[PDB]
């Protein structure tokens, strides 16, 4: 995530050849989708990208203190002083082809944060694992090789499809199935059964 609630998971890992590149050979460490910008109005993300470019070139510190006289126009003037386009755009070529991207791209340094949520500690699977003693059900939590809860809310969405036998399987063979004997006079499982 950036510093503006721009959360995001990694969907793909590209290598530097396949990545686009400016004329300066610089390659984006990160590529984020433009569509996720206007629905959140995180203008400070783009302003930070711009200002971090200006600082990395000028060799100064990015003064992002709130309630400052930092005009985006003055940032643009400083960035143009150093031979770049004043709004953070850069001519970029595709990596696969080297054909210039007809649409120029916003590009620059931006502080990013790696978060405590990681996949290899979230992956989970179970196929006939341990059983809880009380309810003879799959125990809870992947830390104990548990099973997922097929909650009643999901059962409703399943019945909306009308899958009777799929539901029977998800509720009998997938958990705590049991065969019990009952008496035809007193319809209760009080029957002494010597099966052998």
């Amino acid at each position: 995530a950036s510093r503006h609630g721009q959360k995001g998971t990694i969907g793909i890992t590209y290598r530097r050849e396949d990545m686009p590149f400016t004329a300066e050979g610089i390659v984006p460490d990160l590529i984020i989708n433009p569509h996720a910008i206007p629905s959140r109005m995180t203008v400070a993300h783009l302003i930070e990208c711009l200002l971090s470019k200006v600082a990395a070139l000028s060799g100064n510190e990015g003064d992002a203190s709130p309630f400052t006289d930092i005009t985006v126009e003055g940032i643009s003037k400083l960035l143009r002083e150093h031979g770049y386009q004043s709004r953070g755009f850069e001519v970029m070529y595709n990596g696969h082809t080297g054909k210039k991207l007809m649409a120029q791209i916003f590009f620059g340094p931006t502080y990013y944060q790696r978060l405590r949520h990681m996949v290899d500690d979230k992956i989970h699977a179970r196929a006939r694992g341990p059983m809880q003693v009380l309810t003879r059900q799959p125990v809870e939590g992947r830390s104990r090789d548990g099973g997922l809860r097929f909650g009643e809310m999901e059962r409703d969405c399943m019945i909306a499809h009308g899958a009777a036998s799929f539901l029977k399987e998800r509720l009998m063979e997938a958990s705590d199935a049991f065969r019990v004997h009952i008496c035809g006079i007193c319809g209760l499982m009080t029957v002494i059964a010597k099966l052998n």
Binding site: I159, G162, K168
Partner: protein
């Protein structure tokens, strides 16, 4: 309200009309006022309408209220769904609430009712009144784990 009405030529045209809006509801009396139209008047307190204009008019008032709350957000749900909900609430004598006070007090067996709210109290009343559960209800068979009588088990299959 700039409603649309048939022109004498035949095509519809907007003819603006004045309408009153109140902050109170005693319909049984405001209905009998002179100088108004006692056929089109509307009150968002559909409960009083059930009390006055008969239950089936309360059906339409209830659906109109739901339709307005949906279209508030530019949304849309097809008529049949809201109609199912409204008529289920209505199909009894009068308005059956969507809560423990309402449908949960109906005679829809015990287990189907037991699995919503006041579980043990429902079970106690059922064990008292000697409730004979039909067990054709969905939640009953789901609890039993047997194949529930749903579209895929809503029948039997046998041989020629």
């Amino acid at each position: 309200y700039d409603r649309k009405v048939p022109s004498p030529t035949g095509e519809y045209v907007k003819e603006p009309e004045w309408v009153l809006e109140t902050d109170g509801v005693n319909l049984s009396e405001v209905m009998t006022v002179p100088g108004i139209d006692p056929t089109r008047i509307y009150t968002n307190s559909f409960i009083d309408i059930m009390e006055v204009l008969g239950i089936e008019a309360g059906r339409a008032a209830l659906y109109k209220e739901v339709y307005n709350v949906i279209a508030s957000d530019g949304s849309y749900v097809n008529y049949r769904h809201m109609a199912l909900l409204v008529d289920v609430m209505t199909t009894q004598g009068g308005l059956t609430s969507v809560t423990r006070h309402g449908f949960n007090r109906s005679n829809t067996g015990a287990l189907m009712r037991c699995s919503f709210e006041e579980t043990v109290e429902i079970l106690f009343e059922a064990g008292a009144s000697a409730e004979l559960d039909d067990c054709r209800g969905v939640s009953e068979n789901v609890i039993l784990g047997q194949m529930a009588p749903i579209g895929t088990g809503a029948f039997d299959v046998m041989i020629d």
